[PDB]
């Protein structure tokens, strides 16, 4: 009864003298009301049917930003750290390599987080599916007085499969950078997500590869360098891991 | 003004985004552009609108014929080999040569070869004996893009004849694509032989 208290009070105010009521009463719903709480975070619901009141410290400040900037980087660092410029591969280019020799080959999704040293390795273990756009910088440095060029081609997954049946002369139908080493020492090449499915598996080469072929052999003079390194740096323009999985599990997200 | 780059002095590394080219000028000539037909024959819709022979098959019994369709490497169809992906409707042209019977054509992109057991639910077109029929197949594939190089790029074709006796009947298939969406150019394939 919610009127139970207010009948005792009325009775006591009808019996009151000059010293006021001798009794008082109030009825109300308990301070341990029957309610259900539900909390959700990312991929997580927590249905509690007997919650307690949640507590917080004395006058708390839940802004987590440091006002003195003891780590003076943007707070977005650590969420944008799995997409920084990393060294994907490195090879050597002998002066005896012919005119269609394949120098490097970088398995595109998996080579961004294939090893612990790559800072996107940690995030890549918890997701099975990815969709991402790359930025490559292939760097080849030679001294002045050495000729030869290279072809930096982005071959997508269908081209990897059928590469043996293709003409090398029309290999520049793909997003390429034909780089004369006497001039440039770096070929930039932005590649978007190119696949036949919306997402690829993380641990796969299913966004093709980024090969580096010899366009014309090194024409070195006597008493000059013979080997020339070819480094491939990559950076993800956008990264979008999606399917949660057990740590480093091989989860197939394709239909056979 | 005309710069020396438009007289043909360039660097191949200074080619920016792919497929960006400019014409050069000489004193006495420049690009002409003469149309000698009212429509282009290199427009993508137009060129693949014409059909091309795929396969022929002799039906010596009533059994379903599963034939995986794919882009050809001969004919005029092979210009699709310059692309990696494809999305679109495909027309299938079936010439049923029989004395009696009907041929039940159906198309699926489903790789499971056990969904043709009850063929009716894949959408059957019955072709009378000695007739031919063009059916337009919609893009009912799980993948949003078909890989051109795959052996079952254009899905599978199921033909089950309503045989009269065991008298064989033949069927020639020709494919063509109505409004194809081709993406991402890839290298030209090398002619047969070579190596």
């Amino acid at each position, epitope marked *: 009864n919610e009127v139970g208290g207010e009948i005792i009070t009325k009775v006591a105010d009808d019996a009151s003298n000059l010293l006021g009521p001798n009794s008082f009463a109030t009825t109300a719903q308990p301070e341990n009301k029957d309610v259900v709480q539900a909390t959700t975070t990312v991929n997580t619901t927590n249905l509690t049917q007997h919650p307690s009141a949640p507590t917080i410290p004395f006058t708390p400040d839940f802004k987590n930003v440091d006002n003195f900037h003891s780590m003076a980087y943007d707070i977005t660092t650590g969420d944008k750290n799995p997409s920084k410029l990393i060294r994907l591969d490195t090879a050597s280019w002998q002066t005896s390599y012919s005119r269609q020799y394949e120098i490097t080959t970088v398995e595109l999704p998996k080579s961004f987080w294939d090893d612990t040293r790559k800072p996107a390795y940690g995030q890549a273990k918890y997701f099975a599916a990815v969709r991402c756009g790359f930025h490559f910088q292939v760097q080849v440095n030679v001294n002045q007085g050495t000729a030869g060029s290279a072809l930096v081609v982005y071959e997508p997954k269908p081209v990897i499969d059928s590469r043996q049946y293709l003409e090398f002369g029309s290999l520049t139908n793909l997003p390429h950078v034909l780089m004369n080493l006497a001039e440039t020492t770096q070929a930039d090449l932005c590649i978007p997500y190119v696949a036949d499915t919306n997402y690829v598996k993380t641990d796969s080469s299913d966004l093709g590869q980024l090969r580096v072929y010899v366009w014309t052999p090194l024409s070195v003079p006597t008493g000059a360098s013979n080997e020339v390194d070819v480094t491939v740096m990559g950076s993800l323009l956008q990264l979008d891991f999606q399917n949660p999985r057990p740590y480093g599990e091989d989860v197939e997200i394709y239909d*056979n | 003004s005309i710069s020396p780059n438009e007289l043909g002095l360039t660097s191949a590394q200074d080619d920016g985004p792919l497929g960006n080219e400019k014409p050069n000028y000489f004193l006495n000539f420049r690009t002409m552009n003469v149309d000698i037909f009212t429509v282009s024959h290199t427009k993508v819709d137009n060129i693949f609108g014409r059909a091309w022979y795929v396969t022929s098959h002799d039906f010596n019994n*009533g059994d379903t014929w599963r034939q995986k369709l794919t882009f050809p490497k001969e004919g005029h169809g092979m210009l699709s080999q310059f692309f990696a992906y494809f999305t679109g409707e495909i027309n299938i042209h079936i010439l049923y040569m029989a004395k009696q019977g009907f041929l039940r054509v159906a198309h699926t992109y489903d790789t*499971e070869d*056990n969904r043709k057991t*009850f063929l009716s639910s894949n959408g059957v077109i019955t072709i009378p004996a000695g007739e031919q029929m063009t059916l337009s197949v919609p893009f009912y594939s799980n993948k949003p893009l078909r890989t051109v190089r795959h052996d079952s790029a254009l899905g599978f074709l199921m033909c089950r004849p309503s045989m009269h006796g065991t008298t064989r009947t033949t069927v020639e298939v020709y494919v063509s694509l109505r409004c194809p969406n081709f993406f991402f150019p890839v290298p030209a394939p090398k002619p047969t032989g070579s190596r």
Partner: antibody, heavy 118, light 108 residues
Framework: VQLLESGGGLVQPGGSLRLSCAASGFTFSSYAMSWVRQAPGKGLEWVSAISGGGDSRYYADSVKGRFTISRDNSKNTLYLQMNSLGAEDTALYYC??????????????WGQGTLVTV | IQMTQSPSTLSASVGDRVTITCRTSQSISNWLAWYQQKPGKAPKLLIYQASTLENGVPSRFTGSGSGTEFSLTISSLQPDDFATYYCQQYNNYMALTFGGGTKVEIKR
């Protein structure tokens, strides 16, 4: 449920016998049947399967274009017209029945087999 | 395609946990099945759909795995679990195949 094959024997190379498999104890026409063979002391190669209506026949590559699995739902008998036999067709031929509620082929009940010697 | 089993002969005592593995070339999505075949008898279905148990099959048998790595496990051998075990598969192509067999025999 009991399958009983019959028709095994001895034939000369390039022969042509046809195994039968009278079946009882179940509604025959609502299940696919197969003929899986077992060459002496080894494996279990699957020769061919026929769907419940008989409107779909599958053959293994090894015996394809030679054997012809048929069935005659009326008298509950599954056939295996084998033509142009080799010495690789010397096996015990079991007549398996397809499993119940599943969308895949798994062999439920099996016969006792009939030897074929070539 | 062809799937190869891992042991071709296992020898173990009555009460041991034996594991026969079957490994396919390409993924089949739980579409495996295990057979027991006593010598001179026709095969018996044990485990269909990679882990389901056929009726009247002991609970010793327990299949697991999916994709390309299936395994039948007998928790404790009994004297009637000495037989040959084949793994038949189902795939899209309807190219049903069986394993090589794995003879499980007495360890004397």
């Amino acid at each position: 449920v009991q399958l009983l094959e019959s028709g095994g024997g001895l034939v000369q190379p390039g022969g042509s016998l046809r195994l039968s498999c009278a079946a009882s104890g179940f509604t025959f026409s609502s299940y696919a049947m197969s003929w899986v063979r077992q060459a002496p002391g080894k494996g279990l190669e699957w020769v061919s399967a026929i769907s419940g209506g008989g409107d779909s026949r599958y053959y293994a590559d090894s015996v394809k274009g030679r054997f012809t699995i048929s069935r005659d739902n009326s008298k509950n008998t599954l056939y295996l017209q084998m033509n142009s036999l080799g010495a690789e067709d010397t096996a015990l031929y079991y007549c398996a029945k397809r499993l119940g509620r599943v969308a895949e082929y798994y062999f439920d009940y099996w016969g006792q087999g009939t030897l074929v010697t070539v | 395609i062809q799937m190869t089993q891992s042991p071709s002969t296992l020898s173990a005592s009555v009460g041991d946990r034996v594991t026969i593995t079957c490994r396919t070339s390409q993924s089949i999505s739980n579409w495996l099945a295990w057979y027991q075949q006593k010598p001179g008898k026709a095969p018996k279905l044990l485990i269909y759909q990679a882990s389901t148990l056929e009726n009247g099959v002991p609970s010793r048998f327990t299949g697991s795995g999916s994709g390309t790595e299936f395994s039948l496990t007998i928790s404790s051998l009994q004297p009637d679990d000495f037989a040959t075990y084949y793994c038949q598969q189902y795939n899209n192509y309807m190219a049903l195949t069986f394993g090589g067999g794995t003879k499980v025999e007495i360890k004397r």
